[PDB]
Design a protein around this nucleic acid. Structure first.
Lengths: 58, 77
RNA sequence: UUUGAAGAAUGAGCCUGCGAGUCAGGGACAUGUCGCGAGGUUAACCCGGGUGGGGUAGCCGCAGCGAAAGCGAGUCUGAAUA
RNA sequence: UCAAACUCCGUGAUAGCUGGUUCUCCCCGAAAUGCAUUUAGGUGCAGCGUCGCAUGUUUCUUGCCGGAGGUAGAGCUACUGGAUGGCCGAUGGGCCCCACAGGGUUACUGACGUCAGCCAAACUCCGAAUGCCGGUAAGUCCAAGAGUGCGGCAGUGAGACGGCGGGGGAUAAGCUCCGUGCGUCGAGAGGGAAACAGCCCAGAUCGCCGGCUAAGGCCCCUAAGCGUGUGCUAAGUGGAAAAGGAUGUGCAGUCGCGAAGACAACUGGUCAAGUGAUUGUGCGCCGAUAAUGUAGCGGGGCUCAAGCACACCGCCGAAGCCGCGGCAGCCAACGUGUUGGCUGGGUAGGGGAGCGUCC
RNA sequence: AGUUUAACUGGGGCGGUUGCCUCCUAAAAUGUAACGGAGGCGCCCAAAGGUUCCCUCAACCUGGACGGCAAUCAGGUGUUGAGUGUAAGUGCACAAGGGAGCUUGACUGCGAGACGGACAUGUCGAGCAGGGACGAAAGUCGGGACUAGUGAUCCGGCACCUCUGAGUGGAAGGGGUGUCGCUCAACGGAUAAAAGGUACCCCGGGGAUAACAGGCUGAUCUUCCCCAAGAGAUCGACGGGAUGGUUUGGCACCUCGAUGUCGGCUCGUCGCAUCCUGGGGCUGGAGCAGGUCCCAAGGGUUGGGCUGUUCGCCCAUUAAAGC
RNA sequence: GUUACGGCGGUCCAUAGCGGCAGGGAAACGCCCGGUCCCAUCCCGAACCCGGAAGCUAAGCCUGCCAGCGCCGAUGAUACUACCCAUCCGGGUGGAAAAGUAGGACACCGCCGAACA
């Protein structure tokens, strides 16, 4: 399975872990998207920053 | 008021945790009583400080109801 | 100047002039650059109408350890190659 | 001119104090903390910036694994304390006998306990979540412009408010003191909250009379909906407030009585369907209440909602993102300067490159 | 005559405090402030240190001359509730708690590795050598169950050394090793040596920082209200819920390169929680007159004695002498 | 290899302990006899030690059975909590107690040695 994650909210006002999880996912601005395989590490990453991104199943 | 006097913090507690590899002589816990008792390859100091007698990995176990600290001789490469 | 002042914290009526990290020292440390290189360099001074030439006294590198006597790629402690 | 005259000189006295310190652009970018201090508005060292060198992902995030706690919670014949529904029950004193020896009766005083119920920052037989230490696999990786060490140059060492956890105070303060890989401001423009350092959205390299959105909005002021569908509100509630008071109303749930004629009205007669008390609820009402002027929707105005609840459909809306063009820093590729990828808010401050003046 | 006369302080002054140790605050690693809450220390022990061996309390029950709740004796139950020199905490019944025998390791030279840390301090430590103690031996012993019982540097004293010795030999003096001398207690210790007044004051800063005024809150104040124990329409205790910034307060955001501090006079303006006049209601209102409660802010609301006064008391009035 | 057996050890040291009922002495384990020898009593051959085996399984010990007291103990649910929504109220994802209950439990394992084959 393949996940498309797009950033929809700003990093301003977020905690250190949330910014670092967003960076680890690999996106920097609003409306940028990445395609990352559906594994446990990806689930943890999206679970950290679910309030800042939108997830869609490719 | 009478109050206002206190002593310095003594920084007691556990220094190396389970799985950490240590050298001989390294301090494992800093305690007042014998909250942890020495196990294998572990000695006890004058202030009841636990330290390693041989290199290896820290292992926390219970012996006859007492929490003990032991050193496991990690395998040579 | 402040946590914070558009101001009810400070100063300034206006213009034109003037008004605040500089110099000395073979000073000290660091970093560029140039010369020479196990060597580098002269000070006072002397001789040149100059900015040039001479001038080895010194100074810094070239062996360290030890309070010191001292020993020396070792040396100090120590009864000890401990 | 006098709690020690005046003048010159020492002298450009000394002020941990106050004020001032003059051209530009590019890159990075704090702190208001800890310890000590004849110390508290100063300073030394450390923490945090920058530059150079060395080292390479050692930093960080996520998953898994190995660890120690004594908080929240809970519990207590598991301890220690306060307790109780406080029960009998000690212990003392009076009363009654009168001996004062011996004694008994309590509105007497009435120990601990305990059937059972309680409480606890300085209680714990228990006991998390997070956080912390280490291991491990990945992620990011033409970047975080990350860590670590050494050296040059620093500034900072009065913080503020907001959110959570606590202490002091009367859990009162726009009070004070701490903790927080909490945020923002400080040092941050833009949009929203009428205005509004600290709240919400979002981090400004420059240009454009292009587009899409965030928060917040769409009757007029004012850009975009007097939008659609189903309901509620009569209080201008919306558009500030409590204990408490109250035949408002919508929905739902009960029960009592009842065509053998129910309630009202006029135990028995007439009469003619509902008639009584609640239960939780969604909105409403009094409580409500100061002194320049409406003044507690930003204004006009709004229930023919432009109010509220629930679904649905659009659009407006920023310096955010995208489009097109210019510039710059870092790095990469190939070259003998082109292309490409990232980045370019900024005070104290660090580094780099330049304009103009005179000799 | 030259100087000194500390700091903290919810502004100052009196007072208290300043170093070390233990617990809570402290938010389950460490660390964490307050003039926050509780306590202790500036020693002691020649054995209460080292070693070897042995033992197990307190409490309760029963039975015993004095003897009793409680001394000493016996039996039973008793796993920790006793005790550990000394606070508290963490421990210790395997004992670190009780007893006995020998003894001085309450050593000398050292010390891999660490903890804690701005630095200076501080803390633990296996193991090696010498020479010992105890023990059959294995082994343990570099003081004490642990964490307080302490003071840097300088200067000087004492003992020892195969150090040095100002021409030489000595000596003096200096040096090393061990060690002694500080309520330097303001305990990182400005000097070996130090108290006060200033309203005669001066200078430079600071609203860090206060005084009067505001901005906020409300211990207190006042305006009410909630239930009704009662006395008997009117008062309403015991408790409970609200306004206001008209009282004293608390904070220090505002100003120390200036915001006049009380009363009085002159002149206002606003609120209504109404003193008179106006309108009502019930009367425990017969009428008069009041009580009491509603609505109502148009106008009005005196002059003097005493005191600087506001406040207050008094004197005459007035429809009334409002807050 | 077997026995109602004796020792020496274990286990996140009670699921094992305590209590009750019913049994045994082959060798062992004990109680037991005595103080002559080593040794001993803060007095006591009680204990320690030594020398023996007349008696006895009444005790210790171990065997079998009892949930009685203790002990161990789920799942679910809840308390609490990290993050995120939410103008308060509360909600979403994840973690997840203590207590209580169902229940478990009158131990299991290892190495030697006795007596028997």
């Amino acid at each position: 399975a393949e996940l498309k994650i797009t950033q929809v909210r700003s990093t301003i006002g977020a905690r250190w872990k949330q910014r670092e999880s967003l960076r680890t996912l690999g996106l920097k601005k609003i409306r940028q998207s990445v395609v990352r395989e559906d594994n446990a590490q990806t689930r943890g990453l999206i679970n950290t920053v679910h309030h800042l991104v939108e997830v869609e199943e490719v | 008021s009478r109050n206002g006097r206190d002593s310095a913090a003594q920084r007691l507690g556990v220094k190396r945790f389970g799985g950490q590899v240590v050298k001989a002589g390294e301090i494992l816990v800093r305690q007042r009583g014998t909250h942890f008792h020495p196990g294998v390859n572990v000695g006890r100091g004058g202030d009841d400080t636990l330290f390693a007698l041989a290199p290896g990995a820290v292992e926390f176990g219970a012996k006859r109801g007492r929490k003990t600290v032991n050193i496991v001789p990690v395998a040579r490469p």
